[PDB]
């Protein structure tokens, strides 16, 4: 719904101000690293079938108290929702790396999540432990410090997008609590 182009607009809308020449020369900084933004999305979406399976098997070996009967990923049906819950959390944060704004997440999934998990009993500490693998997989994928596959491109800056995807993966915990 909203982007990094339409964040400068909706901020300048509140002052009733026109968009000038020096407020939006930081908008062509987004175009100066524009092919860095598009060389670093294909590392995440082409590994996103491994990454949901690396995460839902990742978090369970530290807390195997909820694969126990009476837990919260015990049943194969209960695990099937967890392969459907966490699949769309990395699908929504792949949009916000493209959009340049962390408000794709705020209104497609985060609204209504926090009063369903108090009704569907989901523990909050185990959920951010699953997302904390994925923020470490994403910083390992958009630069070339990965496990097995190296997405070899023409190299240069990679860390200004790496703190940005760290700034999109942290706020899953901001409304899981």
């Amino acid at each position: 719904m909203l982007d990094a182009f339409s964040r400068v607009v909706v901020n300048s809308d509140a002052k009733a101000a026109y968009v000038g020449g020096s407020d939006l020369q930081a908008l062509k900084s987004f175009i100066a690293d524009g092919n860095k933004r598009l060389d670093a999305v294909n590392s995440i979406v082409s590994n996103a079938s491994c990454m949901v399976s690396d995460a839902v098997s990742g978090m369970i070996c530290e807390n195997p108290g909820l694969i126990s009967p009476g837990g919260n990923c015990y049943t194969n049906r209960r695990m099937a929702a967890c392969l459907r819950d966490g699949e769309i959390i990395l699908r929504y944060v792949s949009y916000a790396l493209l959009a340049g704004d962390a408000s794709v997440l705020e209104d497609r999934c985060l609204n209504g999540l926090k009063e369903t998990y108090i009704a569907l009993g989901v523990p909050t500490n185990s959920s951010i432990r699953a997302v904390s693998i994925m923020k470490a997989q994403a910083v390992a994928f958009i630069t070339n410090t990965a496990t097995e596959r190296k997405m070899s491109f023409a190299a240069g800056d990679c860390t200004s997008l790496a703190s940005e995807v760290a700034s999109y993966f942290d706020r899953v915990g901001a409304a899981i609590s």
Partner: protein, 238 residues
């Protein structure tokens, strides 16, 4: 004057009536579907009417296309849940006909009951576009062009606005696809006594609820009643 419990711009949904009213809202919503499914399997036989799946992998994921739709119509913004709370008092009050005072105060207070009586009576009266069928090519293209302008509610500005997302996981769409073409084969004939319980009350859904005037389109339901129940002008934003 503040520092207590009152906010200056919080996020409600409107419509709230306390904590002790949502239990009375949702239990009397469930009593509507208790009376609405008393005519599909009301004899004692699950008919050719319900059919919750087609094959083995088409049954159990029709539940997850029903409570994700409960969640998709729960993260609506503060306008569009203020919107249909005032529209449940308009649309579902045009469902009883006889304005009786007992079910006047209930339906204009309990909006989940108001959003289930208009949805319950549209499956008792077989008057959706899951139960309707054409016979003419003139009946065909008029019917599917009202369905083309029923997508103007879902995308009103050139963006899809996520309330017809029809699937969250990476193959849920093609499981949602074949269930639609099976349901017009499931509701292909329904009886020999059907296509007149699916046709004559199709001219009793549009012409008395929505268009009180406009005698041309009142005379087109008499020509083609396939578009008379594929119209869906109950504002569900779909």
């Amino acid at each position: 004057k503040f520092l207590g419990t009152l906010k200056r711009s919080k996020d409600p949904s409107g419509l709230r009536l306390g904590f002790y009213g949502r239990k009375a809202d949702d239990f009397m919503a469930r009593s509507i579907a208790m009376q609405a499914k008393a005519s599909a399997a009301g004899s004692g036989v699950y008919t050719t009417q319900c059919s919750e799946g087609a094959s083995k992998g088409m049954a159990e994921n029709a539940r997850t296309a029903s409570l994700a739709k409960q969640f998709r119509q729960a993260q609506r913004s503060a306008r569009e849940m203020s919107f249909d709370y005032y529209e449940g008092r308009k649309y579902a009050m045009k469902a009883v006909g006889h304005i009786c005072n007992y079910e006047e105060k209930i339906f204009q207070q309990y909006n989940k009951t108001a959003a289930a009586y208009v949805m319950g009576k549209q499956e008792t009266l077989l008057s959706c576009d899951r139960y309707a069928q054409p016979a003419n090519k003139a009946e065909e293209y008029i019917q599917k062009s009202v369905q083309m302008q029923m997508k103007k509610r879902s995308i009103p500005y050139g963006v899809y606005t996520t309330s017809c997302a029809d699937g969250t996981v990476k193959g849920m769409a093609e499981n949602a696809r074949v269930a639609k073409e099976s349901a017009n084969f499931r509701a292909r004939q329904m009886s020999a006594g059907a296509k007149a319980a699916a046709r004559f009350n199709a001219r009793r859904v549009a012409n008395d609820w929505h268009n009180n005037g406009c005698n041309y389109e009142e005379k087109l339901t008499s020509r083609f009643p396939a578009a008379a129940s594929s119209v869906r002008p109950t504002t569900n934003r779909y």
